[PDB]
Each structure stands twice: as C-alpha cells, then as structure tokens.
Design a protein around this nucleic acid. Sequence first.
RNA 1: CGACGCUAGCGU
RNA 2: ACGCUAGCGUCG
Length: 642
Amino acid sequence: FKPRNYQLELALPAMKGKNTIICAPTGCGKTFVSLLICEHHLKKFPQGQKGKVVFFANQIPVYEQQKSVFSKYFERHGYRVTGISGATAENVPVEQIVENNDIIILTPQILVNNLKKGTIPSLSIFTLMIFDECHNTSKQHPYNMIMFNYLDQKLGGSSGPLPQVIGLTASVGVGDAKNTDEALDYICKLCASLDASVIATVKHNLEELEQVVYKPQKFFRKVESRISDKFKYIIAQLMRDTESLAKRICKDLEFGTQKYEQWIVTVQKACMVFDKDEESRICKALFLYTSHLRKYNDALIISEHARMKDALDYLKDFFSNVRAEIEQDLTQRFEEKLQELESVSRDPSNENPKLEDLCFILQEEYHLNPETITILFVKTRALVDALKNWIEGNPKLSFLKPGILTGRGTGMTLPAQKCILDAFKDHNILIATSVADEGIDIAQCNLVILYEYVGNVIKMIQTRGRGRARGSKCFLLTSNAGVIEKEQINMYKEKMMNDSILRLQTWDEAVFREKILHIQTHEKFIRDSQEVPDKENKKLLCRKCKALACYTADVRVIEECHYTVLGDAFKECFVSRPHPKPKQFSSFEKRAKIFCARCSHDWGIHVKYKTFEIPVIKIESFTLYSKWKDFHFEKIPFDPAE
RNA sequence: CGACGCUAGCGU
RNA sequence: ACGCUAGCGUCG
Ligand SMILES: Nc1ncnc2c1ncn2[C@@H]1O[C@H](COP(=O)(O)OP(=O)(O)O)[C@@H](O)[C@H]1O
Ligand code: BEF
Ligand SMILES: [Mg+2]
Ligand SMILES: [Mg+2]
Ligand SMILES: [Mg+2]
Ligand SMILES: [Zn+2]
C-alpha cells in the first residue's frame, strides 16, 4: 500500500510526539495510519532504548485482524508482535509476555484486570498507547478505566515516563450538546480523558479523501401504521382475560406499548414478594400468568413492525416451548381463538403498509441494479427472523437471497457470524442488528435500509462505512415520526461536531494543553470523591416456585465476582443440561445450565473452576435484587480448603 | 456467571 | 447529573 497523502497528514501530529485524536471517516484506512505512526515511533529510539506499543481493540474480530496485520508488517523490522485476548488471558505470565514483545495487541478489559491485580505495575512500561474507536473512552467503559490509571500517575506525585496516547474514530460525538459551546465542551472532555492536545483531521488533502470515501445519500421514509384492529382486538381480549385470572388471586392492581411492558415486569416483582404451601401455587400461577401476558405484549409490538403471521408464529413458537398445569388452561384460551387468528393472518387486505413501502423500495433498486447488496437494520432479534420469513415468503421479493446477522445471547456465535459475512460477497441481502456498529469491515453495500432504527451521531457516521462507494444510498423507514426528528438531530449534531473541531484546531497549542490539564484535574477529585455488611442469615427462594434453594451462610464468593453454593443439600434441589456454549470465559469453563428440580426456572450455570466443578448462581433468579452488588451481606471468600 | 456501552421509557 | 426497567451489542 502506497500511503495516501492524507494518511500522512493525520499521522503528522502523532509522529511529532503529540498526543492525538485522529478523526477521519470510516474506510479511509485509519488502520494503516496507526502502522505508520507505530513504525515511526519504534525507530525513533537509540540503541539501548526500546519502545513498547500497546494497540487496543474492544472487539475480538478487530483484535485478531490487527494482530495479523501488525505481525506480518513488523516482523521484518525486528519487532516482536504478540496479542492477548480472553482465551489466552488465563494461566500465562502476562507481565513477561508484555516485557518480551515490542508490539502488543490487547483487549482493554485485560489491561484493566492486570492493573487491578497488580501484575502490571504501571503504564510507564509502554512508550505508546493506541486506542481504536477511542470515542468509547468515557463513563465506566474499559478504555476510560485504563486512562483513569494514566491520569492518576500524571496528576499524582508519582513520576514515570507516561506513554504517548493516540486515538482513532470516525466521530468524537457531541454528547447531549444543544449548541456549539456545549458540543465544544463535550469534545474537550473526551480530549482530556485521552490526554490529547491535538485533534487531527484531513484539511489540505480533502480532495483526495473524497475520491476514496463517498458520503451516501440519505432518504427519509415516513409511513403510516396499520389502522386494522382485527389482530390486536382478539389478543386485547386474551390479555384482558389474563388480567382477570391474575386479578382472580391477588385481587389488587395499581396497551401494547413499552409503557405496558415495564408494568408487567413490575407486576412480577410485586408477585414475588407475596402457609407457604398454596403460596407456591399462587406465585407459579402469577409468574406463568404474567409471563404469557408479557409475551402477548411482544406479539403486539411485532404486529406493528411486521406481518401478523410473524406475531402469530412468535406465539406458535412460544406455546411450543410451554409444553415439553395452569398452562393447559391458558393455552386453551389461545387455541380457542387460534382458528380465527389463522384467517386474519391470511387476509392480504390487512398487510402492513410499512412493509409494502419497504417492498417497494427493494423492488426499485434491484430493478435498477440487480447486483445490489443490501443491509437491513432492525431493533429486536425477533424482528430479524420476522423479516427473514417475510422476504422468502414474498413473491415480489424472490430476487432476494437473505441472510442473518445477530449478537451472542437464539444466540449466534462468532464462527456463525463470520460464516454469514463470507457468503455476503450467495447472500443478496443481510438482515441484521446493531452488531454492524463500529464495523467489522464487511462487504460493501450500495443500499442500506434503516428500519425503525434509532441511534446516536457516532453510529450514524460509522454506518456510512458500508456506503464508501459512489452512488450508495441509505433509507430511514419509520411510522413513528419521532424517529425522523431524532435522526435530524444527529445530523445537526455532526455539524456541531465538525464546527467545534475546526474551532478547537484554531486554538494555539500549549493553551489547549493547559485547558485539558484543567479538565483532567477537576475530573480526578470528583472521581476520587464518589467512593456495612449484614451477618444475618437469609433464605434464598426460587423466584418462580418459591422453593428452598440455599442459605446465605452457604454461599461463597469466587474472585470477588461470582457466587457459588457448598454442600450436597443444594445438589438435590436443581437439575442441569448442557447448553451449546462450551466456551471458557475468564477462569471458568461453561459446561451446563442449571435449572430448578421442583418449575425449571434458570438458577445459573454449572462450570469448572480449577480442580473443582461447582455451580454458579445469579441473585436475579432468586426482597429482590437485580445484581449481587446491590445485595449486602457477609461475603465469605471461596476457600480451596473446606 | 460477571462487567461494560448504546437506545427508548420511567423516577429523586 | 445519577438510579431503575426493557431492547440491543460487546468484552472478561
Ligand atoms: N493506502 C491504502 N491504499 C489502498 N487501500 C488501503 C489503504 N489504506 C487502507 N486501505 C484499505 O482500507 C481498508 C479498510 O480501511 P480501514 O483501515 O478499516 O479504515 P477505518 O478504520 O477508518 O475504517 C483495508 O482493507 C485496506 O486494504
Ligand atoms: F474504523 Be471504522 F470507523 F469503524
Ligand atoms: Mg478502524
Ligand atoms: Mg509471549
Ligand atoms: Mg463497546
Ligand atoms: Zn423453582
């Protein structure tokens, strides 16, 4: 690769030693920029001094790719390149691995753990730190944690040769800024977080850049929601019935929208605090009652954004997971109206006008350009399958050869994700979710459809990375009309972003270097200023059947994070099944998923820790607590001796 | 099992 | 400003 002139331009500040945030559009080759930087940095040292670079990537695919490029590139120059990720994290001398390698590709969460564990004494070991997607440096994110460590050693009395810090991104973001001054403040905060005295962008070479990356034309499609109440009418009855069945027990109480969802979750929270014998029958009934009631609320939301068939099949798939006592009654109410709902799904006149417009868009582009590659973004993983079936089930769309991309959680694994991206060069169109955010550098697309897709200014600028080619088009399809305005804001926010950067770049240096020091200092003492056990024995009950699980005295903590149970008393209370994720995370190894032996509620997982094979539980499956952090009791460290 | 980010809704 | 709920994604 012959370096483009603007790649040198973006590299210039970093090569002169300044801490720099490099802001350039996706696909412009920011990767090769960090190579030029990194190469220049190592060759600046005299014999008897060696530089040590750490490249950060917060996604495994990006991690593996960088380690590949860097290794192939820098092997010739006599620099040893290595990497450490979650799989290679455990049972290795991290300190010596860092010591014996000149360039090190890393996940940030690993450097955080090694700093906290003390295995890595200080960042002074590194002469250079490169943050990829540096806009993630903020809040509690791992990137920011690494910099908190960096900032304390700076502002503290502790003296060390702190590393040069570089960062990379297509956008810094304006945050919540309503204007230039607020936007300029947010960017200044980020610069301080990364200790950057310079924001680098293409200026002199702009004409070259725009012949590489092109800004795809954006279109706003405002449609209308279906007026037909036929489908939601019957289900509104079913939900109205389940409301009575629940009200037929507790007798006390305090819509297919999001507001209604938070209620049913609150109802369940209210039913779990409710003789102890009939109590289990009551709680289990309410749990099963609200569960179906909550999944009926889902079938509504789906019917709005997709076919009625997709919602009916979502229930048809649900009730299949129900079977294999009070469930037989509720499925009876469904089976009763099912015959009627089967016909409503078959009626073409009731078709979603939001889909018809999406169909129309797809017909035009492929009629114009049959070689079109498309990415269709959606919100929920459920809606991913709903549209998959819709395309293959549409005679008009027959030219489409759809494929799916999702995250891990129904979950799609990494090799499953990669398997789709390779066929996307067989696959005509890719239905997906936010996984595409920050980019995997997948196949180029001349068409990008945003289906009820809300996001920030950063994701917006990133998603263009699919449309680098001239003539690429992007559509936004929503019936809400609030989604339109939300995107409009982001467009204005990008303007504020680029205006503020130009305005910041005019400032004399050493004045700005002074301001970031003033931003760092204020942020430090507030960060240091933000910082009672209960020895009583409490009983942990299963949130579903309220059966006895174990006592707080039994529970031990593993490495300050994970909670387990001691004794064979617990072993009679649960069952287990192998879950198809035999991957080792951290010190553990995932083997099977735990279930209630009474019920079948998910308690936690059964793993392998060192020599011992021991279960691990989550409190949110057992007053109620969402996490163990919120649960205050005497924490007994797990002792190998017992 | 845990941590973290984004979006929407809600509350001091 | 934080907190809570859900969706979505990522990492250990
Ligand atoms: N000077 C260059 N000449 C030709 N291709 C380049 C050059 N620099 C980068 N690329 C190509 O850009 C592609 C992706 O760019 P990338 O490094 O991911 O930039 P960004 O991080 O901004 O998205 C790479 O596959 C690479 O082949
Ligand atoms: F590197 Be790109 F901006 F995702
Ligand atoms: Mg990149
Ligand atoms: Mg090694
Ligand atoms: Mg992230
Ligand atoms: Zn149970």
